[PDB]
Each structure stands twice: as structure tokens, then as C-alpha cells.
Design a protein around this ligand. Sequence first.
Ligand SMILES: NC(=O)C1=CN([C@@H]2O[C@H](COP(=O)(O)OP(=O)(O)OC[C@H]3O[C@@H](n4cnc5c(N)ncnc54)[C@H](O)[C@@H]3O)[C@@H](O)[C@H]2O)C=CC1
Ligand SMILES: NC(=O)C1=CN([C@@H]2O[C@H](COP(=O)(O)OP(=O)(O)OC[C@H]3O[C@@H](n4cnc5c(N)ncnc54)[C@H](O)[C@@H]3O)[C@@H](O)[C@H]2O)C=CC1
Ligand SMILES: NC(=O)C1=CN([C@@H]2O[C@H](COP(=O)(O)OP(=O)(O)OC[C@H]3O[C@@H](n4cnc5c(N)ncnc54)[C@H](O)[C@@H]3O)[C@@H](O)[C@H]2O)C=CC1
Ligand SMILES: NC(=O)C1=CN([C@@H]2O[C@H](COP(=O)(O)OP(=O)(O)OC[C@H]3O[C@@H](n4cnc5c(N)ncnc54)[C@H](O)[C@@H]3O)[C@@H](O)[C@H]2O)C=CC1
Ligand SMILES: O=C(O)C1SCCCS1
Ligand SMILES: O=C(O)C1SCCCS1
Lengths: 280, 276, 281, 276
Amino acid sequence: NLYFQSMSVGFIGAGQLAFALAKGFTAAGVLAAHKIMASSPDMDLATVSALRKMGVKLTPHNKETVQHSDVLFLAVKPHIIPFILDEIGADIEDRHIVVSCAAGVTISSIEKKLSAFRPAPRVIRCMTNTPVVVREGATVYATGTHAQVEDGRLMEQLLSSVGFCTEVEEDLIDAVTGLSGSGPAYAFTALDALADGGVKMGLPRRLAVRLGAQALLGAAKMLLHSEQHPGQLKDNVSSPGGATIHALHVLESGGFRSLLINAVEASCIRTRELQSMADQ
Amino acid sequence: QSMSVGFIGAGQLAFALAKGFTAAGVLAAHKIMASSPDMDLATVSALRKMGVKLTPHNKETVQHSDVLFLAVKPHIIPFILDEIGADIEDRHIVVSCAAGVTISSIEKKLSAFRPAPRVIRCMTNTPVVVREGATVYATGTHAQVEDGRLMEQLLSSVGFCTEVEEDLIDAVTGLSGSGPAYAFTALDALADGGVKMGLPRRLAVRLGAQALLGAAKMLLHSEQHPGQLKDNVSSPGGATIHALHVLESGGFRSLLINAVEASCIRTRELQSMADQ
Amino acid sequence: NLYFQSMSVGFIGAGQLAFALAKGFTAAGVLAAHKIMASSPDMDLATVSALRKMGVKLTPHNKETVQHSDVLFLAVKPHIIPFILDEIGADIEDRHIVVSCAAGVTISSIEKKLSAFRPAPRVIRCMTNTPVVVREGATVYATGTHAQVEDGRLMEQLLSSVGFCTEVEEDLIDAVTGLSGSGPAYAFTALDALADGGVKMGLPRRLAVRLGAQALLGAAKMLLHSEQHPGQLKDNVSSPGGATIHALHVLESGGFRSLLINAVEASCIRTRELQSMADQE
Amino acid sequence: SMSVGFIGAGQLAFALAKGFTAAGVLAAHKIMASSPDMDLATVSALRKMGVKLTPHNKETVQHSDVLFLAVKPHIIPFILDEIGADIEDRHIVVSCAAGVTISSIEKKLSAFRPAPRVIRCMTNTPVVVREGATVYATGTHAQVEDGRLMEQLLSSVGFCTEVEEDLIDAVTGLSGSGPAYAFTALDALADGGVKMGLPRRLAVRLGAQALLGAAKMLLHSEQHPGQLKDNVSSPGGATIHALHVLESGGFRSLLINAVEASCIRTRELQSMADQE
Ligand SMILES: NC(=O)C1=CN([C@@H]2O[C@H](COP(=O)(O)OP(=O)(O)OC[C@H]3O[C@@H](n4cnc5c(N)ncnc54)[C@H](O)[C@@H]3O)[C@@H](O)[C@H]2O)C=CC1
Ligand SMILES: NC(=O)C1=CN([C@@H]2O[C@H](COP(=O)(O)OP(=O)(O)OC[C@H]3O[C@@H](n4cnc5c(N)ncnc54)[C@H](O)[C@@H]3O)[C@@H](O)[C@H]2O)C=CC1
Ligand SMILES: NC(=O)C1=CN([C@@H]2O[C@H](COP(=O)(O)OP(=O)(O)OC[C@H]3O[C@@H](n4cnc5c(N)ncnc54)[C@H](O)[C@@H]3O)[C@@H](O)[C@H]2O)C=CC1
Ligand SMILES: NC(=O)C1=CN([C@@H]2O[C@H](COP(=O)(O)OP(=O)(O)OC[C@H]3O[C@@H](n4cnc5c(N)ncnc54)[C@H](O)[C@@H]3O)[C@@H](O)[C@H]2O)C=CC1
Ligand SMILES: O=C(O)C1SCCCS1
Ligand SMILES: O=C(O)C1SCCCS1
């Protein structure tokens, strides 16, 4: 907690991720809102005003964010990262930890940009997801060439306050992007559809959404707290001849499992593809 | 609390509820009794390790408790009601957890023995074991108003709980009753996808489960429609919208509708066989 | 109360789009038909005779359109654009605003052709759709290298009189083409099929067509005027256990959503593919 | 001067009341709506509009000259039993309920007074923006002036025409359910825009504008929708490529399936009701 005593955090970009992390960080009480600064060229988005009401300092100028922050989150779309790196590269100092949240963007490409300005930029690449907004995020991070050993420890302590966090090799991160980065969108789709199923069978929509979301939350918590395999927990629910095993059969007949595999694969591949376009 | 709880049936649900109740601190384990004809099942051993009183005699459980949970398989319910119908006192609240079984069929059995049985019907799910269950309940003909309030206070300690009209319960069964099994299937598949793309299985399972937990929590804590939360994730041209497309191309949404429908219909069908 | 009293408009091309815009502008009262000129090598066209009955001036000679006009719409098929630019490039004056409506054709390619004749051509690229003919179009536009700020404001005023209009970065226009440019065709296909459904269930075809079109119009208007997500508006229609949620299930079972995604993607990709062939040439 | 009542204070009552007041045909405070659940969001919107709210259906009847039945179809018989003795010769009774026949309504009401004036209608939520699609059929005792009055009233919030009653279940499957098909389609078109690089807000706006413009074009054209489609697609172009992938998925057949499924379910529900 001495890490966060006087630490200042900044976000280049003031959109969904910046709000989600800033909301989670302040809710966890690890950072006061006034120690957080965000910059965006369009202060007309719904997220810029939400950060304002939160007590986060805003500015149009990315150089202002760099001069204020000790830990600097890059929270812009991936194709903007090289433009921002050209713009504020001469402003990065030895004190800075540069934490890239951008999907696909490699540590190598960031270090190559910044190293033209100062020889030893401290860079950390991260992949998280929007549920950090409720402190139930899923975060992985990889440390760059010049990151100090306390840099990774500090980063893990920070991202652990808003969910699961663990260090990985960088070559896992595109796959993590396809699973837990895109994950929430798959769950929101499933919950919308489960609610439609409830409505089709006679439930009011508000109740069907509440029950479906509670069912998913509880099942996920069960798995996280169990040493048993997912299939064994499935078997615990399914009584012989009963309703659940009948419903599992219709999922299997539609290739339900294969669709989710397809989704992780497609997101991972698109992530890889976007970065190959970027480097080329 | 001076409250004594009993379980007829000492299987998965009895363990999940007793584990949840005691973890919530609303019941002491020694004030709980559970009965089963096979005193050597694994759930029986798990209940015993928790401190629960176990016995093979369903009459013992009835005489022990004030709130009596029926946690046997649905086809066993009529057998149980004939066995212990003569032992039901004015003090008892009988809470049937059995899928499909109607309040009418329970009240009909018990009323041959003593008028005005106090009956509650509930549908819950296994995540009460981690205090994140989803529970609905319907009050019977002779349940008093405080009976419903007491059961909601009790079941709210282990998850979401709300009162419903009984004719919603077979549909709830198909959604949140069977729901966890849909989620375990999806988590297994998502982890397979992670492994295909290079992740160790243990990490893929942890991330998939955490993603689903976080997304469910976001929706429960947001006023927004799940479609809008979906919109907020997917950036234009990005990985997430590409993945959502392959889900749509397979009819993902329709499979989940199919599942809730099939579970509900099977629940209705099974009770129609019981009535005949 | 808008009126461009000093603006002369010309169309290179006198086909479906020129008619739809000329009809929309004149109905909007922002231009008098006799201040519009259109050219085409085929005066034996249904659209040419329609433009004539509005009062639009017609000529077979593209140079005459250029000499008459201030704002010059390029309303020919995309592969004709380079030929057109070679033909009248020497006739472009300082006063001209060249507005290309051609699918896929880049500002860069237009400016490169015209700059060989006179530096600083003022070019605007737009993508619109046929419902401008009923003043409910969906239009986006992007300003070129030498377009002045008043040129884009003026074009947004003009094009806002026949529907929605906003400025975009040019790299969005091929995707807009696939959504709102091709979109009316998706809708006409859907309405034909919904009417077939009405007829199967016992409705006369005329009534089925009227009701299906009115349902789509009303729903689109509800979404445009609502702050709610399309999914929430969908939830408000369906009664539990009811007819609508039964019908939504059969759409989902066929991958209905995926087909519309497929369509937008296919139109955008084809639009990009065609321009790549043009610029290889 | 006309006083209007709604039995039921949900989505349809709100949409109609918002449309009528936006059209200037009724004062909000000349509308009264009743519901037992005075805690719905629709009830709060109605109260903010200035509509009179009461839990008592009898009060709505006594207030109204024109009385809309806006409860769920399975509620109509209980409603008719409850306030049948309160329907007067002056009332026009307009049922909006999906599937429910004039014959079933007249049978209940005629046990009280001999000649109840009944009109059946099917409409849709876009009356809220005064672009509804409405049909109606006149009952046995409805006067010629009653049909003209209802057409005038419902034409203030969209298209309105008289039909024979045997068309109304089919209308329900087309324009009654229709807006939901369009909302699903608009959500998916926006995902398509986002997949190809557009911001979600812009994609939603463009998709909705394209659909609105195209429907207006057809309503204002004598040409067949296939001919309007032909006018968009140039040879070898983007639009005809996209039309091909729609055809390859059976896009047309899915919309036929939807109209049929909604119509069949509407008939199936009413067969269940009249069986009871
Ligand atoms: N939303 C999500 O689900 C997650 C997103 N991410 C990553 O975070 C990054 C942003 O994601 P979102 O926040 O969803 O994007 P977003 O589009 O919601 O916000 C992006 C922000 O960048 C700002 N911006 C644009 N140009 C800028 C510039 N030149 N200088 C400074 N700010 C500028 C925009 O104004 C906007 O505020 C992406 O790289 C994405 O991969 C990672 C994890 C989850
Ligand atoms: N496990 C679940 O996912 C949920 C189960 N339920 C309902 O709870 C009931 C049981 O569910 P599970 O516990 O999964 O079944 P289970 O089979 O794990 O437990 C069944 C128990 O009943 C006992 N039993 C059999 N005959 C008996 C008798 N004559 N007297 C006393 N005990 C007897 C068995 O020995 C066993 O301990 C079913 O009606 C089910 O629908 C409801 C919600 C969730
Ligand atoms: N119709 C639509 O749905 C929309 C069309 N557009 C664009 O507008 C342009 C034209 O579209 P349509 O009007 O549908 O084509 P169209 O084929 O109806 O009319 C094209 C016109 O170009 C004329 N033409 C051919 N060679 C010419 C030349 N050398 N000089 C002058 N005129 C010549 C033809 O005689 C015809 O009048 C295309 O680039 C298309 O992408 C853009 C948005 C919507
Ligand atoms: N929502 C739509 O898209 C359209 C609905 N309809 C028809 O309108 C009727 C209702 O539709 P929604 O308003 O969507 O239902 P809704 O469920 O939103 O509201 C129904 C209202 O009935 C009230 N209600 C329940 N029991 C009652 C009773 N005994 N006395 C008085 N009110 C009672 C409920 O509290 C609620 O306010 C249905 O028959 C439906 O078929 C027809 C055309 C379009
Ligand atoms: O195992 C089954 O099939 C039944 S058990 C009670 C809730 C879920 S359905
Ligand atoms: O018809 C096509 O293929 C082109 S022109 C119509 C709108 C944009 S795409």
C-alpha cells in the first residue's frame, strides 16, 4: 500500500476502459480520484463526463497527462498507439511506467518507438476487461525489457484491486484477448438469449434477466471455488431422465461447444491479424 | 435463532443448502438434521463432516425440525408424504424443493392426515453452496403471511430470492434451475478454445470463469440492457465483433432459447406423468 | 426558410441518383428546378424524361453542365468517373465544388485527375441513398484537400434538406456504403418477404405490403426518437409466452442476425475490391 | 370532449396515450388507466404525462366513453366478468388484445346488457411516434358512427383501416409483431456496420434512417418492392453481392417463418382460451 501512497496515474484516452479502470480503482480505495488524470481530444463522449463527476482531472492535452502521471495507461484504440507514441515520446522519463492496454500491440513496437527518445523505457503490456468496473476483472500482464522488478509487483498489486491478475509471457496475451478480453460480450449475448428463452416460456423480462444473470454468476463462482472438473459439476446438476439433461442435449445438437471455441479462435486471430497490419 | 431445519433427502441439494446456510451464519450446523436410507453416500459423509445430524428415519427429521425441506427426487415425493403425513404438526412449514411437483399435489397428500398443512414450493439451484443461488418460491393455500417472509429471509442468505406465482416455477426451472449446467458446458468449451489458441488449461479455465462472473455481475449492477453492455465492449472492426459474428452465424442465441424451452417442457411433461 | 439563391447545381449523369436528388432538392424548396442542369449520352431514359417534367435543364454535353454549374455532382457509375474527369477537367474553374457520389471512388483519385489541369480542385466525396427522393436519405460526406470550410458547411446544408447528413472521415465511407447505401435494397427484400408471409396467412397482397412497410417505418422512427437500445424496444413488444417471442425464436434459429451482418460486410468488401481494381488500372 | 379509459396500464396503454396526446386529439387528464400493479414503469410514465391512474377497473369504466381493453389476452375474461355489469349503452368497447374474438367478448357482455358496442383492433407500439399500423373490425352492435369514430381516432396516430375480423390474427403476425422483427434487424445491421469499422452510434443512426427512408419510398411508390430493389443494385456492384448472401441464407424464408409463427401462436392461444 506504500506503492500507492503518493502515486499518480494517468490515462491516454478517456473511453470505456479508462472509465472502467478509474471507477474500479477508486471504488477499491487504492487511488483517490484527484490523483487520476485522463486526456481525450473529444470531451463530448459519455465517458468524459462520467470521469468528471467521479472527480478525475481531465484535459485535452496528452502531454499534460504524461507530466502528471507516474503510471501511464495507454487506453486508446490500437491503431492510435504509434501516433500517441510519436506525440509524447519526448516526454517519457525514467520515472514513467508505460502500461499499454491496447489489444494486439506488442511490447517490442512500443519499446522501439520510445527507445528512439530515451534508452530504457519501462513498458508493461496488459489485457483486462470491462468488469474491472465492478472489481471483478480478469487481467494478465507481461513485463517489458526495462521494467524493473518492483514494476511488475506494483502493477500486479494495482490490477489485483479490481479483479483477478497474473503475470504471463507476452505470447499468451492475444489468446487471453480472445477468451477473457472478449469474454464479457459473449456472456452478454448469452444472457440476452437466456432471457428471451425465459420470456418465451412465460416469465416477465425483468425477472428472466435477473435469474439468468444470477445463474451465470453463481455457476462461475462455483467453478472458481471447486477443484472438480466442469463436466463433473455438470453431472451434479443432471438427474437421470430429467429436465437439465434434456436441455443439454439440444445445446449439443446445435454444436454449442463448437460455437464458443469458434469465438475464442476468431477473436484471437483477428487480434493477431490487426497487429500484423500495424507492424507492416 | 431457535430455528430447527430438517432435510428429507441427504443429497446434492441438501448439502448445498446446509453448506450455504451455515456459511451465511443463519443456522448452526447442529440445529440441522438430514435423513437418507443410505447412510453411506458421499453427500451424507460431507454433511456429517459439516456437523449436521444424520439419521435413516424420515420420522426423526420431522420430529426434529420446524422448517422441513423436501429434498428427494420428484418421483419420491409422494412416497415421502405418505410416510410422514401423520407426523406433520401445526408448527411445521413444509418446503418442497422438488422440480415439477405442484403445491396442490402436496397439499392433497398431507390434507388426508391433518387439515391446513403449511406448504411452500421453491425452485433454487446448486450455487447456494457459494451463497450465490437464484431462488423463487410460491406460498400454499394455508401458508401464513409470516411463513413467506421467513422463507424469503432464510433463502436470501444464500442468493437472490423472490416470491412468484406458482405457474412461473416450471419456466424458472428451465432458466436458473438448469442454468448452471448450461454455464458449466459453456465454460468447458471456452477453456477448450483458450487451449486451442495456446493457453494452459488451468489458466484458460480461470480466465473463462472469471470473465463470466464479472460480466454477470456487471449486468446485475447496471441499469443498462445487455445489448448495450455488449456494444460497449466491441470496438469497430475489432476482435470482439468478429467473434460475435461467428456466434451469430451458428445461431448461438437460438440454442440457449432451445435449452430453456426444452428444460421447461420436460419439467411440465414429468409432472403430467406424475398426475396420471 | 433556406434557399441557395446564387447556387447553380449540375449533374454529370441523369440516372436514378440524379433524379432522386433533384426531386428531393426541388421538393425541399431549396433549389428551383430550372437552376439545375443534368447531362447524359442517353436522352431515351425514364429518368431523363422525369427530370424534364420537373423542369430540370437537360443536355447531352457534359461541358455544358460544367459551364452552367457551381456545385457539380458526379452521378455516373464508378468506372465512368475517370473518363468524365478527363473530359471536363480542363473546364473546372476556381468556383466549382465537385461532389462525387460514386461508390468507392476516392478523393485522392479525383484530385489526381483534376490537378493535372488546374491546381487546388475543391472536391467533396459523399455517399447517400435513394430515399433522398422522399427527403429521408442517409448521407455522409468527406471534404478533400482543397475544400474550404464553407464548402463542407454548404454541402451539409444542401444535403440536410433531403435527409440525415453528417461529415465523416473518408475511410468510413466504404462501410457506410455497405450499411445505408445498400440498406434500402435489404429493406425492399425484407418487405417483399414479410408481405409473402402476410399473404400465406390470409391477407390480400396490397394490405400486407402496406402494413409491412408501415411497421418498418414506425419501428425505425421509434428507434431514431428513442434513447433506448433496439433490444429494449424489442423487449417492450414481446408478451411472455406470446406470439412475438415465438416469432423471434424462429428468426434466431435461422441466424437472421448473422445474415444482415453478412450483407453489410459483403457490400463493404465488394466496394473496396472494386476500387482496388480501379486503382490497379 | 371524449373521455377515454384503458383497462391495463402497460406498454400499449402508454404508447396509445402518448400518441393520442401528442396528436392533440385528447387531453392527458381526460385519459384514465387502471392496473392492480401501480408500481410498473409504464404506470409512472403515464402519471408523468398527466393521465389519471386508479387501481379500480370500475372507476375506469365509469370515467370512459371509449374504453380500451389493454390487458393480456388471458386476463380479458376475468376483466369482462368484473366490470360487465358496469358497461352502459353509451360505451364503445375497443379490445386490443391479441387473438381475442369479438364473439367471446360479446358473449360475456351480453349477459348484462343486450347490445354491447364492441370493436376489435390490432395495432402496434409505433403509435407512440404517431406511425402505428392499425386495423379494426366492428362487432354485432357497433353503429356505423362507432366504426367511423374509431377510424378517426386511430388514424391520428398512424395508418388505420377497417378489416374483416378473420384477417386480424394474420395482421398480428405481420404488423403487430413487426416492430420486434425490425428492432432485431436494426441491431444486427448496426453490428454489421461496427464489424466494418463504423462507431456504434453512427451505425445505429444510419441503419435506422436507411430503413425509415426505404419504407417511406415504398409507401409513396406504385412500384413493386422488387423494382425498387432493382433500382439500387448496379451490375456487378456492392448491393447485388450483398443481396446474394442474404438469399444464400434463406433471408426471405425467415421472415415468412416469423409472420406464420406469430399468427399461428395467436390462433393457438385463442383456441386454448375458448377451450376453457
Ligand atoms: N472496452 C473493453 O472491453 C476493453 C478495451 N481494451 C483496450 O483499450 C483501448 C481502448 O478501448 P475503449 O476504451 O473501449 O476505446 P473507447 O473508444 O471507448 O475510448 C477510446 C478513447 O481514446 C480517445 N482518443 C482518440 N484519439 C486520441 C488521441 N489522439 N489522444 C488521446 N485520446 C484519444 C477517444 O476519444 C476515446 O475517449 C483499446 O486499445 C482496446 O483494445 C482492453 C480491454 C477491454
Ligand atoms: N441438485 C440440483 O441441481 C437441484 C435439485 N433440486 C431438487 O431437489 C431434489 C433432489 O435434488 P438432488 O439433491 O440433486 O438429488 P440427489 O439424488 O443428490 O439426493 C437425493 C437424495 O434423496 C435420498 N432419498 C431417496 N429415497 C429417500 C427416501 N425414501 N427418504 C429420504 N431420502 C431419500 C437419496 O438417498 C439421496 O440422498 C430433486 O427433487 C431436485 O429436483 C432443486 C433445485 C436444484
Ligand atoms: N442509385 C443508388 O442507389 C445510389 C447510387 N449512387 C452512385 O451514383 C452513381 C450513379 O448511380 P445510378 O444513378 O444508380 O446510375 P444510373 O445507371 O441510374 O445512371 C447513370 C447515368 O450515367 C449516365 N452516363 C453514362 N456514361 C456517361 C458519360 N460519359 N457522361 C455522362 N453521363 C453518363 C447514364 O446515361 C445514366 O444516366 C454511381 O456511382 C452510384 O454508386 C450512390 C448512392 C445511391
Ligand atoms: N405491446 C404491444 O406491442 C402491443 C400489445 N397489444 C395487446 O395489448 C394488451 C397488453 O399489451 P401490453 O400493454 O404489452 O401488456 P403489459 O403487460 O405491458 O401491461 C399489461 C397491463 O395489464 C395490467 N393488468 C393485469 N391484470 C389486470 C387487471 N385484472 N385489471 C387491470 N389491469 C390489469 C398489468 O398490470 C399491466 O399494466 C395485450 O393483449 C397485447 O396483445 C396489441 C398491440 C401491440
Ligand atoms: O436435474 C434436473 O434435470 C432437474 S433438478 C432441479 C432444477 C434443475 S432441473
Ligand atoms: O448499387 C450498388 O451496388 C452501389 S450504388 C447503391 C448504394 C451504394 S452501392
